[PDB]
Design a protein around this ligand. Structure first.
Ligand SMILES: Nc1ncnc2c1ncn2[C@@H]1O[C@H](CSCC[C@H](N)C(=O)O)[C@@H](O)[C@H]1O
Ligand SMILES: Nc1ncnc2c1ncn2[C@@H]1O[C@H](CSCC[C@H](N)C(=O)O)[C@@H](O)[C@H]1O
Ligand SMILES: Nc1ncnc2c1ncn2[C@@H]1O[C@H](CSCC[C@H](N)C(=O)O)[C@@H](O)[C@H]1O
Ligand SMILES: Nc1ncnc2c1ncn2[C@@H]1O[C@H](CSCC[C@H](N)C(=O)O)[C@@H](O)[C@H]1O
Ligand SMILES: Nc1ncnc2c1ncn2[C@@H]1O[C@H](CSCC[C@H](N)C(=O)O)[C@@H](O)[C@H]1O
Ligand SMILES: Nc1ncnc2c1ncn2[C@@H]1O[C@H](CSCC[C@H](N)C(=O)O)[C@@H](O)[C@H]1O
Lengths: 251, 256, 254, 251, 251, 256
């Protein structure tokens, strides 16, 4: 399992998957939230993917630099950009965001949507990444992450099998193993289709509790300034499935 | 829920050629004989209407008891199964198959001593509004004495998880029957795929959707349709109905 | 699940039994089991009930312990003979085609008779398990002991009715299990399912009849056995209610 | 168990109980919600109680007629009114709201906060009540109810026992029985104090599910106009513990 | 904890407790079941208590000998008998039914209702008791037990606290410890009253699973002849909270 | 929430005179001896510091091993119990009681070969910030060799319900120990009353509050405090720590 194998497998279907099987449908709202903080300056998406968020941002006239480790994901992105009327505002960068190498450039916002931070499989690595994000922010800037909230996510300890989504001729199931000590989720997204085809798309995450994530930020030189349930600024509480957290350079 | 092509027809269409072959808990419940006795006891020894007759799991047991049964069914393939069976049945001449949608019954002058809907058939109509319409049309088809009987999953005793679930339905030597399902406790809908995995590598999916009603609500729907509840059991063998009953069988008659 | 022998477990799983990764495979306690058994073996031969592919037999042979292995499954037995020919100590493993519900070993006696990894529970009834225990007892020498490793229902927290679970993940397949539990007949009846990236599906069915400790102990008494020690595993960790398994040692009764 | 025994017991502590033991802290918000619908005409609260909502409404210059069955609850109300700078705007009525008897008077809003409609132990009785509320609405009028939402309320079937709230020198527990058929909750709120004292305060509800409630409203001649999670108009979904529903006369 | 302390405490309330707090309301049906098996000969109730079943049997003209360890329970029995028109047919015996001592006398039925046999805290003791019951049966005789069925009882592993019953001015709660190895239930029935009154009634049970109980009977010289869910001969299955089992002397 | 009179002190004050008398699961864990052996092994020839020494359930077994112990305690009544026991104990002179709040230790020049907090004592400090401060101070009191040892509930294996719960802790012939608690999974706080109901009609309430930390988080706290983790067990007998371990015992030393 690489930094890359998530992207590699899923690239060509990431955008086609229906409902709960796909990524969350908050592209537009995410773009507004980031854009609302971005002003006229450029922003850095970590793990830009197929640009689910980047393109909505470019529609708002926001320059976005997308770091991505996956060749195949990156190709999807560049394909979509060439067809997008605003593609020129999306700047794809091949690279590993655990070890960003962006030189002089600085950003008004650095964000990681939909568990991207949790794609780095260790607390250390996540602290490194945050510290790096910090160092790329300009005076005003902020760091925005969207993360599963373990409490509200009600994660069975051990192994689990669940129904993700139904289509007319396929089902989307997920088989997974949870290690509540390492705090890791390791899983297969399974697609079963009529007449018997089976496709498996594996992923691993390391998650953090909020109190922990906030201390991680603190070590990174970040301090938390707001926390919501989603990009529409809904109230965050214990039963929130996700959180959106905004951080800024610390005193 | 993102099963964007679901008809009043696609349940039947898919399942017709295996509906009768599925073992144990995978197949329909094994109370055909009982349900026929139950309905028959209620026939003014006269013709009854099965809503969603299917392959005739109930209709043929009724024909064996000398009861005339009109079966309304929306699925071309189920109806083909039913007709193919009737030709071979020694009493098939007592089963009258009707192609049609029972949300919009059109049977003219004919009246019935019993209109029934077994095994969640009524909940196949995906709406409270539609269900009421159907009950009222049932009511209007009953003769003086007549009654309307429904067999329905009882939400309480069915202990339905909120949200999505995945479950083992039945095991065979060379295949498993699983169910993948989505429950919307507000819309009160169950939306699901019955999955059959086989030693080949083969996979067949058979989707279904239900809108369920709670007994208090269902009784109020019957009241709106001009029916009043006359009895309620756990099964067609008249076992006592209580909170932990998985299903109920309810009998309604025209209102005062 | 209508067509289940004493054979169909083995027949199906033999060529993959040894290949399945992590939790999908048999427990990785072969060496420890051998040690545990060897310590009670002395200088005499031991009888493994349902020797299978020799997951425990070969570790025993490595310790210089002679092992007679009873197995009903042609295919399992063939795996065993194949590994024995290749093993440096294969000669110390004695395979025996037979059904251990009806052992027929004549004059031979054993310093230990053991059934690992729920093998005793493969006999689908309380009656058959008693019979087998009685037979094992009658095959022990003076000193001998009878050793079983068994799932502990309490610690195993079995749901009532049907369940479906993820057993293990591989890069290109998943191992699932579909099961039915009958808490009254105390039976577990299941399919181990392997889905692979091809679209291939392989099903491997099994059936167990479990027994609660208090009940198994009574069964042993009726068979002329009395319990001497109980652990959680072959490393002699303390047995308690949340132990997923137990290892019980019985000897002939006074 | 009368229409009366809920109030009779709880009156003298209803307002003193802390946190989750007391009634919800949305009196102000309720008042605002009702007031916005009130226009220039008087409104009718069903089971006004101690005036937790009535008085906030009076602060907004809205005339409130309060119907209540419990002598002791009513006494608490009148006591608070005399002290309240706007007490004269609250009009207490002894009576059973299952059998309202208000003659010619008409209201711009009839409301029932905090499960009050659910105090009537039968679907029949609830329908009568709604029909009667309908007939007391002027032309524009609306009927507002706040009700537990069974889905979001995740009610165990059968008996349960639970912690309600903690004080320095008491605990608030709750012993209850759920009949999922009759859809009734029958309970004792229990206060154990450090003295060795025990007080019990029993209550009964019959709840309805939203789709059922709506159909009841229809039979009463009402139609649903809006539904929220609370009086601040948050969105109502499956996991909403309560709902607030606004109904108006039907076409 | 004695073989006695169950009875001693509960005697004066055993018959007064409402609903689910009381003993099951199947006394009449029990008597009918036992009478049908009784033939012309006398029957022996183990742990007769306050004669919840013995008196209904007397009403059927059946002679009942009742063994009881609890002085106070026995006193309740004798008090009811004197008042009962058929009390003369109930023969109380002070004694411990783990160690019956009835000499020459033989019975057409020996029975233990409502977990009575589970009152002996050990597999050994229970076998002994069965073997003695066997040895007291005449030729035709049968041994009858009513027992909690652990499967259908869905017993939490570990401690629990539940609501047993509700009264207008008291609640019945139960605090409990389950040892799934020893197969023991150890508990306090708790009554809290509006006074400030707390009463604790402790009990212990050792249960057996059916397969195990049947093996026990085999060791005692009994073989199982029929099993129901209750004395009305409803069908026993996994979800049956109790079972009624009828044994007879073995071949 | 509404226990608005909760000090560093009100746990101790209330429980002191029954802390040692409570049976089975209601009392503190019976691992005093084992803790003492574990700590003494790390202790070397310098004094050890117990945080929240309480009634000396661990201190006295240590003094039995000839180890000098300084016990910080905030509770007047607990300390009174401790002093009472020491006077009667053959080795009490080795136990040195200190009135103080270990969130704000003030021990001057003295240094320790071990500083430990047993049975969730560190979690008595109701905040992540306070717990770090306390770890940093412990760090600063350790000599060169020194280690800092904590015994803490492991939330994963503790399987804490989210929200409020009510449970049976222990049973006596004439009293039950129940527990009523509220769990805030965001604040990571447990707040509760231990309730004793007795045959008299008597009610005793003993309230407590914890802030727990997950191990990964606790380690990062230790890192911020200048500590690095050197070993982790499930208990003082060094059994293996895993997901289903109810507690953990963690040893930290000064960082490179
Ligand atoms: N270490 C790493 N460096 C760079 N990209 C990474 C990475 N680990 C994961 N990724 C990429 O980050 C993405 C996580 S998926 C999220 C895609 C996109 N942000 C969206 O919300 O739709 C994938 O495209 C994956 O290939
Ligand atoms: N709107 C509609 N009109 C007519 N038939 C319908 C319908 N919706 C579903 N059905 C049919 O109703 C049946 C439900 S299955 C029940 C079949 C039969 N009553 C039995 O118990 O065996 C299916 O045959 C399905 O095709
Ligand atoms: N009645 C019976 N007689 C003989 N062997 C049996 C049997 N029932 C099951 N078996 C065999 O017992 C084995 C159970 S698998 C256990 C194998 C081996 N002891 C190990 O631990 O790895 C299988 O080989 C199965 O084929
Ligand atoms: N049938 C009936 N008629 C009139 N009032 C009733 C009633 N049944 C219950 N009540 C009263 O309705 C109130 C429910 S409590 C709600 C009080 C107030 N609405 C608040 O939100 O704070 C109690 O005061 C109770 O005594
Ligand atoms: N070892 C023993 N010997 C005799 N009686 C016992 C006993 N252990 C318990 N008992 C008594 O048996 C009774 C169990 S309660 C059941 C009472 C009665 N059979 C009924 O159904 O209502 C109590 O009266 C208890 O005191
Ligand atoms: N902030 C603080 N400062 C000092 N002592 C404290 C404290 N908070 C809690 N305590 C004390 O720490 C103890 C927690 S209970 C543990 C007691 C002892 N270590 C044992 O193992 O048995 C109580 O005695 C409590 O009064």
């Amino acid at each position: 399992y690489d930094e890359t194998t998530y992207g590699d497998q899923i690239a060509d279907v990431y955008d086609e998957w229906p409902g709960d099987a796909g990524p969350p449908p908050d592209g537009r709202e995410a773009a507004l939230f980031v854009a609302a903080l971005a002003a006229a300056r450029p922003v850095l998406e970590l793990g830009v993917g197929t640009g689910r968020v980047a393109f909505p941002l470019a529609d708002l006239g926001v320059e976005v630099h997308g770091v991505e480790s996956s060749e195949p994901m990156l190709d999807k992105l560049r394909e979509k950009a060439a067809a997008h009327p605003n593609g020129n505002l999306v700047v794809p960068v091949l690279g590993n965001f655990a070890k960003l190498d962006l030189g002089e450039q600085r950003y008004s916002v650095v964000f990681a949507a939909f568990n991207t931070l949790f794609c780095l499989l260790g607390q250390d690595e996540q602290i490194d990444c945050m510290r790096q994000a910090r160092e790329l922010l300009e005076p005003g800037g902020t760091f925005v992450v969207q993360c599963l909230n373990p409490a509200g996510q009600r994660l069975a300890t051990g192994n689990t099998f669940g129904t993700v989504e139904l289509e007319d001729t396929a089902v989307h199931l997920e088989a997974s193993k949870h290690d509540p000590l390492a705090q890791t989720l390791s899983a297969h997204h399974i697609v079963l289709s009529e007449g018997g085809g089976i496709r498996l798309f594996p992923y691993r995450l390391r998650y953090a509790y909020p109190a922990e994530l906030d201390l991680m930020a603190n070590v990174a030189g970040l301090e938390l300034v707001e926390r919501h349930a989603d990009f529409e600024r809904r109230r965050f509480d214990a039963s929130s499935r996700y959180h959106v957290s905004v951080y800024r350079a610390a005193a």
